[PDB]
Symmetry: C3
Subunit: 116 residues, 3 copies
């Protein structure tokens, strides 16, 4: 009946759960400066949040992927993304260009998933 | 079983409800020209639509926030956003740069929420 | 209990279904080079995926519409979109500017819908 929250601050909660759905905040990279490293860090953050929320990679429903420079970084994004995904179990996805809150951020990914 | 709609025109419905979920159209500002005023107006429009749809601020699940100029306006957006939110009950959120349908629009916010 | 998938490749599934919800990957045009033709092709692809997933146009819940050039193409997008929609049954929607994965792609649309 009530949404529950994980890692709440004044602006956002890292995850919000409602019934069988998990809504994740857009995840941004860690300390990597390169597109490959940043995508790894974003996806690692998503996997931990899925775990915390009672979900898993195999239960992702949708991912919107934002790239600062889609022409430059789409191939690198796809390389890391396809290796990270569980085989044969890819989610719905949309990949578009958008600047993120800091100019050094090259990639940000927003996930909705199903509770297990 | 059926989705229901609020404020339907030829292009969109301001809100679409399905079971316990409320999907809002991206809300744009009123008459304000400044980022603070425009964010206030967007958020006021969202709160009325939540009320109409049987939801409330405390039941927002996700918000995607689009800023015309994220470097310039992120801090002002966060100031108004954090004051508008119910304390300790922030939703999942993603903030990215995108031009909106009119060049004078600085901010647009798309919300999904839970029916009460 | 389990999400099911339609048209899965190494990067994405064209549709992911979970309970009464259908999540579509962002759909891109076919061979058209013009905005009118491309929007027709995107929307035709969405309608087939809705059919495959047990949904229909009348059960769309949300659409995010991405335009490469929102100032240039918003009016053409709206013309094709409003004619494609079932009368009086428009979904929630958000339209923003974003470059897509290829520079020749002018429009991409991401839909969530309700199973019938």
């Amino acid at each position: 009946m009530e949404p529950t929250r994980i890692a709440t601050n004044d602006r956002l909660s890292a995850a919000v759960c409602f019934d069988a759905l998990v809504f994740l905040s857009g995840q941004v990279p860690g300390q990597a400066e390169d597109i490959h490293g940043q995508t790894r860090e974003v996806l690692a953050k998503i996997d931990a949040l899925l775990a915390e929320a009672g979900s898993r990679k195999e239960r992702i429903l949708s991912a919107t992927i934002y790239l600062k420079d889609i022409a430059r970084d789409f191939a690198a994004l796809n390389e890391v993304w396809t290796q990270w995904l569980p085989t044969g179990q890819a989610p719905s996805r949309t990949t578009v260009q958008a600047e993120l809150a800091r100019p050094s951020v090259l990639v940000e990914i927003t996930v909705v998933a199903a509770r297990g």
